[PDB]
Amino acid sequence: MNVIAILNHMGVYFKEEPIRELHRALERLNFQIVYPNDRDDLLKLIENNARLCGVIFDWDKYNLELCEEISKMNENLPLYAFANTYSTLDVSLNDLRLQISFFEYALGAAEDIANKIKQTTDEYINTILPPLTKALFKYVREGKYTFCTPGHMGGTAFQKSPVGSLFYDFFGPNTMKSDISISVSELGSLLDHSGPHKEAEQYIARVFNADRSYMVTNGTSTANKIVGMYSAPAGSTILIDRNCHKSLTHLMMMSDVTPIYFRPTRNAYGILGGIPQSEFQHATIAKRVKETPNATWPVHAVITNSTYDGLLYNTDFIKKTLDVKSIHFDSAWVPYTNFSPIYEGKCGMSGGRVEGKVIYETQSTHKLLAAFSQASMIHVKGDVNEETFNEAYMMHTTTSPHYGIVASTETAAAMMKGNAGKRLINGSIERAIKFRKEIKRLRTESDGWFFDVWQPDHIDTTECWPLRSDSTWHGFKNIDNEHMYLDPIKVTLLTPGMEKDGTMSDFGIPASIVAKYLDEHGIVVEKTGPYNLLFLFSIGIDKTKALSLLRALTDFKRAFDLNLRVKNMLPSLYREDPEFYENMRIQELAQNIHKLIVHHNLPDLMYRAFEVLPTMVMTPYAAFQKELHGMTEEVYLDEMVGRINANMILPYPPGVPLVMPGEMITEESRPVLEFLQMLCEIGAHYPGFETDIHGAYRQADGRYTVKVLKE
Amino acid sequence: MNVIAILNHMGVYFKEEPIRELHRALERLNFQIVYPNDRDDLLKLIENNARLCGVIFDWDKYNLELCEEISKMNENLPLYAFANTYSTLDVSLNDLRLQISFFEYALGAAEDIANKIKQTTDEYINTILPPLTKALFKYVREGKYTFCTPGHMGGTAFQKSPVGSLFYDFFGPNTMKSDISISVSELGSLLDHSGPHKEAEQYIARVFNADRSYMVTNGTSTANKIVGMYSAPAGSTILIDRNCHKSLTHLMMMSDVTPIYFRPTRNAYGILGGIPQSEFQHATIAKRVKETPNATWPVHAVITNSTYDGLLYNTDFIKKTLDVKSIHFDSAWVPYTNFSPIYEGKCGMSGGRVEGKVIYETQSTHKLLAAFSQASMIHVKGDVNEETFNEAYMMHTTTSPHYGIVASTETAAAMMKGNAGKRLINGSIERAIKFRKEIKRLRTESDGWFFDVWQPDHIDTTECWPLRSDSTWHGFKNIDNEHMYLDPIKVTLLTPGMEKDGTMSDFGIPASIVAKYLDEHGIVVEKTGPYNLLFLFSIGIDKTKALSLLRALTDFKRAFDLNLRVKNMLPSLYREDPEFYENMRIQELAQNIHKLIVHHNLPDLMYRAFEVLPTMVMTPYAAFQKELHGMTEEVYLDEMVGRINANMILPYPPGVPLVMPGEMITEESRPVLEFLQMLCEIGAHYPGFETDIHGAYRQADGRYTVKVLKE
Amino acid sequence: MNVIAILNHMGVYFKEEPIRELHRALERLNFQIVYPNDRDDLLKLIENNARLCGVIFDWDKYNLELCEEISKMNENLPLYAFANTYSTLDVSLNDLRLQISFFEYALGAAEDIANKIKQTTDEYINTILPPLTKALFKYVREGKYTFCTPGHMGGTAFQKSPVGSLFYDFFGPNTMKSDISISVSELGSLLDHSGPHKEAEQYIARVFNADRSYMVTNGTSTANKIVGMYSAPAGSTIL
């Protein structure tokens, strides 16, 4: 933070020379001085450069123009106004949050002003920085605690070892000194929630709109288990979404609970839709309690909102309809909802308290917001036993946490507060919507085939677009209205190959080929499917990367329509088998894999495999308990009819839990196994496009074998 | 890593000028050139400076001298020898590991040599750096992957926010760009153990002498659960040390297991000794299995080795005597045993495999070695189900881990390999023994009272000193020979106040005052007791801090014998209550608290409270399960006789588990309650010296309340 | 206070170059570096120059000689001792009041030591300076109180007048800003004896050996009249 901007062209010397003297005085105090030419020139500097922290201007020339515009971008930004004898405050400036400090045009006095700017800038830094982060940074600069844990003590152990010195020189002195323990009393403790630590949790809860917040140092995968073990005791019943994370499966393996699975909708492409409103009814759940053995009334409910592909649930419905005392949302993909006005009534923190019910939110702070990895938030809306919740919190949180992760959790929350934080979200949405508009515009203007965005035909309004039954862009049949909403920044592109009806097309290009082409240029796709491609437009995505992807997509069409060699277009795929893709071209490869999908009937087998769920034999807890004793054996995939599974099966595509540990594949769930065996055949023809199944093991012959319980 | 040393004047120009040209050529490649004077002057440079990576010397002048001495400090260190016409290789240089490159004295050719040194140095950097850390650093320098998770993508999101930019400028670009996920294919995955990630685990196992090693991103607190849940299924019996970590208690709260506790010895001071040899035998365990309901034969045994106070168990005895199929060692305090020749047959990795038995080690890599916080290792010696162990590993480990914590775990192992690594441990032992000898030397020379090291009278040999039964320095009655060994770097000082017999002395100074005095100068005491103080001599502890503590201790005696004011000597304690310590002096304060210990009879009640264990009613699992239902109430400490506890009671001193959740205070375990009530009285007299009990709540009236089950 | 002295003649490079790097690092932090030739040469520097506030020396060469002699001139004076592997504290050093901070001979690490010296020197300044004087000096550097009495407000009224500017330029900014009233609450009040004011009186009474001390702003000529009017009422007799 060392950038000070000075506007204005004077022409009078009694004003110019004091500015000249201030320029030299500020440069000696380690500051970059920039000179904008006009009113709008100055505004663009603050918009692009965040390191700007000082605007110097004549009050009698720019009191009405800037003062309203600058406050819209940053309220805390220090303003230094140089005024004359006849200067007056306007009534419109009364409604504006402005940190204005006044000064006089004087020779020699510039050295004293330079010291007043330094002090105001140092106070400005303390204004934006959150409690714990401000305390940690102060400790690194001044604090000297010797004989502490960790044993490195700010990188002292590293400086003695030849290999250690390379590790210290890389991360820097500020990173190494920040890594400490609870030995420092002025910073407090995470497990005890005292001092700057409790101030941090209160700061996060204020920004994210929650009654009480908690920081997790081991990611959301651990955050789910803290909420889970608290609201779900042993021998109880839990409601869990089928479209769930790998960690939620682990929770069921660790805690002795009987699960009831939600049934989420799905389309032709493989995009998982929302759980119907009929599933949340009091009568539908009570019937499944009767059917499932050892099952009572649910005490904890887990719903994944939003989805991986970007679909928000109407929480105002679920909070009122669902008759469970503990409702928990896995908000790993929507930690930006609370700040933008378009997400109102779509997130778990919306509205407020529900009588006799507690609402949870576990967010992946790093995944979409700006924070270090393993940083997670637990937002609690309602009343909970704070003495008992901390017991479950301490079970999964270590005694000596990495303070850098704790700080990044708090910093991420501070990055959202104020108009500067709101513009970060609103700017991210506008970049995504503009990207969606450009694809559609290029689709009409380009010659031949082009990519299509998975969105409504009329996106004229900036909002979460509702999924209405009268529309067919989403591909769900008889879907609930005012229930599902499409997330703008979750852009899903569709490659030509499938129709609007759900039937196959003649001409088609697989999405896995486009995903491997973008991997050459550097772009990584988050979720790769048969014909769908998911792109994340996080707050870390700028206008630069918005055009770099847009150019790369048009370069795919240019190289495809001209039909270039696989050897030329895909050098990474060529390295895997040079003999195989020696003479093959891009038009040949695209038609080859497309015909394999048609021949093996992938999209229809994908639909039928997930609609019917495998029969529950024993709880995921009992499935792992039998594995611990050593009563498991490996049989072939064709032999698993009527066998109890030990490991979770995760097939790509789509990349969602198909078979849980403790479930059995029978005649009821026969389309499940027909889908898995089909993947073994289709992923053996062409190298690079292997079969991706978690739990299954690729053998010497080629058949995938599964781990099941003994008899 | 830019230090190149040039040795000797030559007196001849045909040698000096080519060196001078090389000097300028290397400086253009950003190298700092140092000029040692003599043979031993060069040797001291490498010992003090780790960033030294180049030794330039004439071959015919320093052939025999250096080449044997350099390799003893660093083998990988690149040596550049300039040789003449009659230069020959000696036979004594055959047995030495030396990277020697030869060059000619030539004008102008120095520019070509400079690039050859640059290449050799870059090859040297690749020699010492371990696989994953090398791969991570390579990605930061070259790798460009956009549209990835986490959303910051090398601090791109941070540079847009005013408060974000400050967070970026602090940690630096290299810290931010290192934070990624499994999106990068060339780095691999932690959960899948693939690529560089598997190379890292095989590197750690090789250095720490283990069959299989794992990296934990959530500390040792999480590493214990991974081994715990794997080796102990529900309804099985476990052996667990009473001197255990808070995390091992949580393990019993989330896994349905019935525990049998080991009985460790204790002295008069409060130092916890080892568990007797009779406790590990087949007969003594079999009796307790019969005596405890719902208990079968133990399947998993956990022992804390070494202790907090630094006492190593004879592992070669335990591995043979104990007839349990799974043995766990909580080595959070000894991650340096496998590198110094004195720890042989004293750690869990020593010797090797045991038939039909598996040995575990969970190490705190940050606490004593050089690594980031939350870094932990699991070392496996024996045969384990790799498919099933990974399941328990994935349950507690997050899907997206912090790559900085992963890298520091691997780098810590690289800091141990070779003579460059061996000198760090041998050096830290050298510093601690020297410190121990300096205390004893000053004890004999100083006028009056002085501190004494809790050690044998004759410490003439450099080894782990065995606790013999003929000796009485330790204070344990009838202790087993060749069973316990004193750790050299674990220095424990004793302030006068107790006798060698175990009785109280007339003159005495509490250790709590000395700990607070050292806190003023910055020195933090790890374990604070009544009359004992613990000091850790890790690899991060240097000769500077070894003397800074030695001076701070002698400054205490000077300020005590002259008797300064508490206002002057303890300014931080003066802030607590200015009116209370206004006229109090250091000799008056030391006599007051010492008389409170004698009057309340602390050391005797502390002995009898831990000798007899509270009778177990229900398992720690069942205790927490009742707490989840809401059947808990708060009662006074005086009325908890015949009550079932819900929270673990951790009293300071000594800071070890006294009461577990599910245990009852009865008539056979009455000294337990007598010890806690006495702590409430003694910590109510003087401010600053408050009562520290974890689980208990200090109320408005003063009486402490414990949380017990409803009945 | 910006004078740091460095003793010793080494001959070994692993000690000389880290001192060379410390020299350049301290000069950037606004310090004069002086190099005494021998033991007595260093002692004469401290005797004549009061602005000296740092002695840098090898511990293994000058631990017995200087440590007894320097303490006799100044106890608070910060000492920076550079020690090797085999360094031990003598028993005669136990009876001496010495502020010794230890450091290692290392390349590059000199920049970090320079920041440790600056912090120790700034703590040394706070050790010798008395309560009220320390509070006043801190106010001039940081404090910004506007609309106060006296009306000059740190020499703002003077900078507007042609004749006033000559008065301001003479005494300096530090003299003009120090002149304030009881408007500043963190400094306290003289007439009420509160805060730094009462701490000052207690400090003076401790040094001059008195039960209670008072400060007079109008000389001894006024100090006699305060004592006089208290112990001598009207119609009484005085000696």
Side-chain angles (χ1 to χ4, degrees), chain B residues 585 693 697:
Chain B
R585 285 191 178 269
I693 309 165
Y697 309 95

Side-chain angles (χ1 to χ4, degrees), chain B residues 332-607:
Chain B
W333 294 115
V334 273
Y336 46 78
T337 48
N338 201 72
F339 323 109
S340 185
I342 60 165
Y343 301 98
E344 288 188 323
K346 289 151 190 68
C347 58
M349 291 298 100
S350 188
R353 287 170 167 263
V354 186
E355 287 188 57
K357 292 173 191 172
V358 56
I359 317 296
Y360 295 98
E361 268 203 30
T362 53
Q363 296 175 338
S364 285
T365 321
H366 62 96
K367 280 190 182 191
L368 277 148
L369 297 183
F372 276 101
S373 298
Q374 302 196 85
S376 186
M377 294 172 175
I378 301 172
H379 304 291
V380 186
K381 185 83 81 170
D383 291 316
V384 282
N385 201 313
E386 204 169 346
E387 293 177 14
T388 315
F389 193 85
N390 193 42
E391 280 284 324
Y393 175 77
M394 284 183 292
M395 285 174 192
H396 294 274
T397 316
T398 180
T399 47
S400 301
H402 186 265
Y403 278 86
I405 301 167
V406 185
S408 61
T409 314
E410 195 200 25
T411 311
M415 284 178 71
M416 306 288 105
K417 195 171 183 174
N419 301 327
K422 286 172 182 180
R423 280 184 68 88
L424 282 155
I425 299 96
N426 283 72
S428 63
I429 301 163
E430 218 110 69
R431 287 186 289 267
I433 291 171
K434 197 181 178 292
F435 181 84
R436 283 163 172 264
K437 283 177 181 176
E438 279 169 332
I439 300 289
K440 288 278 189 183
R441 187 192 56 90
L442 285 164
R443 185 172 165 86
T444 323
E445 291 172 338
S446 293
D447 188 45
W449 70 275
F450 202 75
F451 310 97
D452 193 43
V453 189
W454 190 68
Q455 68 180 4
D457 300 310
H458 301 287
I459 47 157
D460 45 55
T461 175
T462 308
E463 66 162 322
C464 302
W465 309 288
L467 280 79
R468 293 159 70 105
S469 60
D470 48 53
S471 299
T472 46
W473 62 267
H474 43 265
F476 308 111
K477 295 171 183 175
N478 293 117
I479 200 157
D480 294 296
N481 298 322
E482 295 174 329
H483 176 65
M484 297 313 292
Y485 299 94
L486 206 288
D487 204 304
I489 67 153
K490 296 283 188 69
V491 187
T492 317
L493 286 166
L494 295 164
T495 57
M498 289 196 78
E499 291 296 316
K500 292 177 182 177
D501 299 315
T503 48
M504 301 309 295
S505 300
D506 190 40
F507 179 76
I509 314 154
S512 56
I513 301 164
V514 192
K516 282 188 175 290
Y517 176 79
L518 292 158
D519 194 275
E520 311 284 355
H521 292 85
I523 303 157
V524 181
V525 185
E526 197 69 42
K527 193 179 185 287
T528 169
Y531 298 100
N532 57 311
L533 296 159
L534 189 82
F535 296 96
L536 311 167
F537 272 78
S538 63
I539 52 167
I541 301 295
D542 44 46
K543 57 189 186 286
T544 280
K545 291 151 190 174
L547 293 163
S548 286
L549 177 65
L550 195 71
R551 186 65 193 171
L553 286 156
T554 53
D555 280 336
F556 182 83
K557 183 183 164 62
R558 179 194 53 84
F560 188 81
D561 291 22
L562 286 163
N563 189 30
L564 280 163
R565 290 264 293 273
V566 173
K567 188 175 178 176
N568 294 311
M569 195 168 166
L570 297 157
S572 300
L573 194 71
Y574 180 74
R575 304 191 230 271
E576 291 271 337
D577 199 4
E579 197 182 320
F580 208 96
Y581 298 104
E582 194 72 53
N583 297 320
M584 182 79 71
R585 285 191 178 269
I586 198 80
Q587 283 196 222
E588 197 185 325
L589 182 68
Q591 282 190 16
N592 283 338
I593 306 161
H594 174 259
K595 283 289 175 183
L596 283 166
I597 301 158
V598 182
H599 178 82
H600 288 280
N601 201 19
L602 203 152
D604 204 59
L605 278 164
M606 193 168 63
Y607 183 80

Side-chain angles (χ1 to χ4, degrees), chain A residues 9 23 85 106 171 219 239 263 300 358 373 416 448 456 458 460 484 509 515 548 640 660:
Chain A
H9 235 323
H23 170 260
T85 316
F171 284 88
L239 285 164
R263 323 285 270 266
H300 189 64
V358 56
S373 303
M416 310 285 102
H458 306 282
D460 43 56
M484 296 313 291
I509 312 154
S548 285
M640 73 182 297
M660 291 290 188

Side-chain angles (χ1 to χ4, degrees), chain B residues 32 34-35 37 41 44-45 47-49 434 438 441-442 445-446 542-544 547-548 550-551 558, chain C residues 11-14 21 83-89 91 93-94 96-98 102-107:
Chain B
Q32 195 181 24
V34 291
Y35 284 93
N37 296 110
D41 192 21
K44 290 289 279 183
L45 273 163
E47 195 183 313
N48 291 307
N49 310 297
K434 197 181 178 292
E438 279 169 332
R441 187 192 56 90
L442 285 164
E445 291 172 338
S446 293
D542 44 46
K543 57 189 186 286
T544 280
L547 293 163
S548 286
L550 195 71
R551 186 65 193 171
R558 179 194 53 84
Chain C
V12 280
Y13 192 85
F14 82 100
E21 285 186 31
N84 298 121
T85 316
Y86 295 106
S87 302
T88 183
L89 272 160
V91 73
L93 309 168
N94 302 13
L96 299 162
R97 293 198 69 180
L98 298 162
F102 298 96
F103 293 107
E104 282 176 309
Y105 290 107
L107 297 167

